[PDB]
Amino acid sequence: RPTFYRQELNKTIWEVPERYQNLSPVGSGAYGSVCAAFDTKTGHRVAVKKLSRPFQSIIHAKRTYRELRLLKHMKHENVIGLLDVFTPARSLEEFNDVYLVTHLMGADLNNIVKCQKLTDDHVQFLIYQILRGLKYIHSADIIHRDLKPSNLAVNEDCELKILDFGLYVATRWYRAPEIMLNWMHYNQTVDIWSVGCIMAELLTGRTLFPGTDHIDQLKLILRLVGTPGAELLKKISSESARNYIQSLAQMPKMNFANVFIGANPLAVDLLEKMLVLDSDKRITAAQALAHAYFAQYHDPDDEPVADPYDQSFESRDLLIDEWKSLTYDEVISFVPPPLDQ
Template identity: 50%
Template sequence: MAVRSRTGYYQQEVNRTAWEVPERYRDLKQVGTGAYGTVCSAWDRRMGTQVAIKKLHRPFQSKLFAKRAYRELRLLKHMKHENVIGLMDVFTAEIALDRLRDFYLVMPFMGTDLGKLMKLERLSEDRVQFLVYQMLKGLKYIHSAGIIHRDLKPGNLAINPDCELKILDFGLARQADAEMTGYVVTRWYRAPEVILNWMHYTQTGKPSSRFVSSGVEEKAKRKLTFFSLLAVDIWSAGCIMAEMVLGKPLFKGSDHLDQLREIMKITGTPAADFVVKLHSQDAKNYIRSLPKVPKKDLHSLFSKASSNAVCVLEKMLLLDPERRVSASETLDLPFFSEYGEAEEESEALPYDQTMDNTDLPLDQWKRHTFTEILTFRPPRDSKETSL
C-alpha cells in the first residue's frame, strides 16, 4: 500500500530509509551519516541553491535522544553568524504532536571540511590565516552566547569552495553521548586539563576519563573553579592551526596518558603552581612522577611559519588554561591585522540554558521540540546562515 504524504510533501528512499520532505527540496543524495543522523545534499528550488538536510536518527526513542534533539534544534535556531552553521529551515511531515516521529534540519551545504581539505593539499600561510581567522570569529560568537564547543576538530569545520568556514556541532559533545555510543571527544585535539581533571584510575591502574557535560552548568562551575571552560576550545583551535601549518597532527597520542606525554614533550612538564591547582590527586601524582622536560621553542618546531603565526600558536597552546588567550584576544594579534574588522567580529545574544539542565519526561521534550519547529522563522537576511 502506497503511503500518502502530507500535501506539499513527497517520499523518497535514501539508503533504505524513508525521507518525507517538502516538494521544494529535490535531488536528495546522502553525503554523510553518523550516530545521530544522516545528512543529504538537496536542491532547494525556492532559493535556487544547494542545501544540506539532516534527518535525526530516531530522535524520540528515549528521553536522552529527545533532549539531545531538542538542544540541537534550539542551538541551531540561536546561531546567526557567518562562521557558525545556522538553520535555514526545519520541518516535519507530521501535523499532530502525537504522530511526531521524525523531523529534519536544513542547513547551508558547504561541500567539504578542513580534515578532508588537509588530506588533499598543504595549505599556504595565507589560507591558514584566513581559515583560522574565521574559526576564531565563530568561536568568539559561540563563546559570547555562553556555549562551549568541546569537540572542535578539523571534521567539525565545514568549508565551501570559496574557502569560507563554518563551525558545526557546537555545544553538542555531552556526557550522555559517550554513554549512548561509546564516542568521546577526539583525543588529539583535547585540552590537557580535560584529561587531567577527569583522570580516574580503575582497579587495574589504567586511567579512564570522564567528561563533564557541555553548557555552563553549576556542577561544571564547581568542578572547574580553576579551569576556564572556554579555554578548552582555544587549545583545540591551537592544535588545528598547528596541523594546518605542519600538514600533520601536532599531538598524536595513542591513549589518554600518551596524549599527555606528547603534549608535554612540547609544552614542557608543568611547574608546581600548575600542579597545585589540579583537582585530581591521581593527576597530581602522575605529573609529579614525570621526568622534567623543558618547553620546546615553537619557532624551531614551526620553522617554515612566520613569527606572527608562531606567536598565535604560543598563546593558544599554553598548558595552563588560565594563561591561554581568549578567541577575542587572539583576533587582535598581528597575524590577523589585515582582517581585523570589528563589526564582523560580532557577539551573540545569550543562549538560555535553563532547559539544558532540566530532567523532563519524553513526551514533554517532544512537545517542546514540536513548539520549536512550529515557531521557526527562516532568517530574513539569508546571508546570516546561507553562503
C-alpha cells in the first residue's frame, strides 16, 4: 500500500497516493471532481477523478461498478483507458471513496469545431479514429449511446480518444431517431448515426440537426433523410410512433451532394451510408473503416477487436453493499498497464 497524503480542493477532501503531485482542479466542475496532477512514476501529467457519492444508493453503486468494469476493459489507442484506480481505505469496511486515473486529454471537439470548420484531411483522420475505437467497443457488445463532440478528446497531435464524461452541447442533436422515439429495434449502429452527425458538423462548422426537443429533432432529421418508406414502416412495432410518422406530410430524401455542397464526394457518400433511417441498412464501424474516404489511413491489420466483456451483471438486482463489495474486488484486482514513453 502506498503512502497517501490529504488535502482540500474547491469544497472537497482529496486523499491520494504521493505518486500523484501538484493537483489542480480542471473544467470548473464541468467534468465533476477532476484534477490534473503530475504522476511521479512516469513524469507525465494525468487526470484524477474522485467519484461523487459512489455508493449513495443501489443505482449509484451499480453505476460506479459499471464505470469501473468498463474502464478496466478498454485497451485501445482510440478509447480512454485506466492508468490507475485507488481508494485510501484499507478494508471493505472503511471503503467509501473511489478515485480513477486516466491520461489528461488536451481539448474536446466542441472546443475545436467552435474554433473553425476543419480541413478534409483533418476530418478524415478524426473520423477514422472514432470509427477505429467504435469497431473495438462494438466488438465487445458495448454501445456508447452518447457520442457527441464533448465526448471526444483530441491532443495537439490530433490523436483522438472516445470517452463519456456524463452529466452547451445537447445529446439529442447526435442521437439516432430509433432510440429517441421507441428505444426498441436498435443496435450498435446508433453510434454510427452519431458519427455521421459529428462528421457533418466538422465538415460544415454547423450542427446538423439542432432540434429543440425530440419532436423538433425528428422533424429536422426527416427533412434531410425523408419520411420512412413502406419498408421501414413495416418494421415499426410501436403503433403511436407509426401513427405519428404516417400523420406527417411525406418528405423526400435529399440528395446529400446538394446539402454538403463542395465537400469531398467520398465524404458525402460515407454520410449517405451513415445517416440512413433504417438501422439494419446503416453502415457498421468495421464496414466504414474500409470505405474509400479513409484510403490514406485504413490498415486492416491495425484495427483490432476487443476481448469479450462480461455484461451479465447488468441483469442483476443487488443491494448497495453487494455492488460496493464487487467494486472493491475490482479495485483490488486492478493490474496497472505497461508504462510508455
